[model samples]
Target: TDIENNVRVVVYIRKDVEDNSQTIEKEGQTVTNNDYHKVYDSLKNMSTVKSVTFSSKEEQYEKLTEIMGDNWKIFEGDANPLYDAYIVEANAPNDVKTIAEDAKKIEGVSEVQD
Candidate 1:
């Protein structure tokens, strides 16, 4: 066994992957009336915002009644207290924190959460 010995070495490395998605929350106490086009458009034009969806309280109420299951029906007769809101997802390649501040500046937006 005088022959030269051979050795094998292996290295495994895993790189960290980033989750690029950031979901922003918005609550509307200011959209006050049924005409929220101004507010909705403002959100739509907000920089770094890919898209926004307006969710009226009525729509939100029905979702809870349907998806939250039968027990939620107990509140069916009661008026929906949910404040109308918009859900925002990032447009791309940018941090979402700044948008919250800008969102607050929108005339009919309230309680912006980044």
Candidate 2:
């Protein structure tokens, strides 16, 4: 049987894989092979991560516009504008802090919040 624990986290990715290939390093250790695929793979493999929700670019634009209104135009100027991220729900015994730290190590990931 699967046990659903408490705590939900949000993972924000800054850029798409084709636009960014930056290395993800944590505690001096590399976490990903410098790609979005690896980042998703790593997150999915984590014992603490029970579920993940990836937002499409169009969805991101709609959400941002809903929040920022006209200010959304500012982000629209970039070649890779708009936000792309994953909402990860944790069901493991690990605390949110640890989960956030682990998520921050992924390349392309901009922020992680509970």
Candidate 3:
């Protein structure tokens, strides 16, 4: 039976990486389209990483507000920063815990949710 389950992963990206580094914004080696596909394919084949998506600009802003609250504005100026990316909504064929753990270990990834 097909199930409806999606996990929202909120990634906090380095501000400098977002503004200065184009590679980080890109998908594959730089988080571009091809790179994202590689991760998606790997997840589909090995783990329960069914699908991935970036949070909408609005959603990203809203979430940041929620998490950062009073100090949200401090995220600017590179002193501290949080940029969201790769908001994955996926279903696990097996155990999500293992998937989350493995995903977090991926180079350049700072966090994951399952």
Candidate 4:
């Protein structure tokens, strides 16, 4: 396929969630506070993602992880901790609004700041 340009979107992940236990218990997975950093890093390193950043926590890290799957990461020494949000930069041929909308649906994903 030809090269495509994707838009940058920001996502906020919640640190507190009741389903945390259920998610880990059944899925054997959980997005720790530190994992948020990793998630942003992953997103930045991703080929599809042109740029990515962490932001306020509207949804929750676990939900963002579930939605992003293995497409995101967090950056180290990144300020704005405890904000419970993430800033994502993705590059796709499709509409960025659509991508942001879909990302907002992920569990724990409270809001997409576009």
Candidate 5:
């Protein structure tokens, strides 16, 4: 929380053009979006992390459904099977990369973007 630069680190739990009617674990990732608090604390406690934000699958669903037009809701009724996400504001650009790297290793974290 002290470093003070500008960078956003996206830590994902694991997406898609077709039927994303599945969770990261079932789709091949090792962990599910469950126990996010586990990783949240880890990331939040990171020295480089200035702030952390948790995103839900519901928000993702709305964005997808909204952006992909109203028709992509083919599996809308099946449940929003998208993965949850975590966004961390890093203290520095360098920290962002390392933060993302460490996040990947953290349980329930699948990938990092930005």
Candidate 6:
């Protein structure tokens, strides 16, 4: 039997680290501190977004190690330089592509993946 499908997309918004410059270059676009806020606001206003959850760097590290298990290998440092992903769950599968595209257009959104 086929399981029920639940459409989900994740939008990664780069964090502004205090010590380092808050700018990320991706998809031929620059995401600065100002763009972060703009992208966040845009995501908040989306009707298709059922929920948004923020993840911390520490949490990300733990999750990665757990998932990687014995195959885990160090890339650079103790932690991964990943963005705070906004977990977006849509009402239907058909909405995921549109939602992802809209999120990608946001200034600070580095990536949107389903």
RMSD to the true structure for each prediction, in A, is: 19.8, 8.5, 6.9, 12.9, 8.1, 8.0
For model 5, residues 6-109, the per-residue Cα lDDT tens digits are 58887776533111223345557654444436777788888877888777678878888777577665777876778777768987787777887888887667
Global CA lDDT computed for model 1: 0.49
C-alpha displacement of 7 in model 1, angstroms? 49
**How good is model 5 by TM-score?**
0.68
- lDDT tens readout by residue for model 6, 1-114: 121345777787756532123677768897664344455567768887666655555667678767756455556364567677767677678888989999888766677887
Return the TM-score for each candidate structure.
0.55, 0.60, 0.47, 0.40, 0.68, 0.65
lDDT to native, each model:
0.49, 0.67, 0.47, 0.51, 0.69, 0.66
Clashes of each: 0, 0, 7, 34, 0, 0
Candidate 4, overall lDDT? Answer: 0.51
Write candidate 3's Cα lDDT for 1-114 as tens digits: 233554544333333223222345434454643333444444446444555554434465666667748564545443433344454444543556666666666554556655
Off by over 4 Å in 4: 1-6, 15-48, 56-82, 92-94
Off by over 4 Å in 5: 1-6, 14-36
Cα lDDT tens digits, model 2, 13-114, are: 775452223456679986664454565777888887777767656786777667747755545666536556676777754666778898899877887775
Per-residue error for 29 in candidate 1, Å, reads 26
Q: Using lDDT as the measure, which candidate wins?
A: 5
Clashing pairs in 3: 26-30, 26-31, 26-32, 27-31, 27-32, 28-32, 28-35
Query: Model 1 misses residue 53 by how many Å?
Result: 1.5
- Give the distance in Å from residue 111's predicted Cα in candidate 3 to where it truly belongs: 1.9
Candidate 4 residue-wise lDDT at 67: 68
- Model 5 misses residue 44 by how many Å? 0.8
Error of 6 at 21 (Å): 15
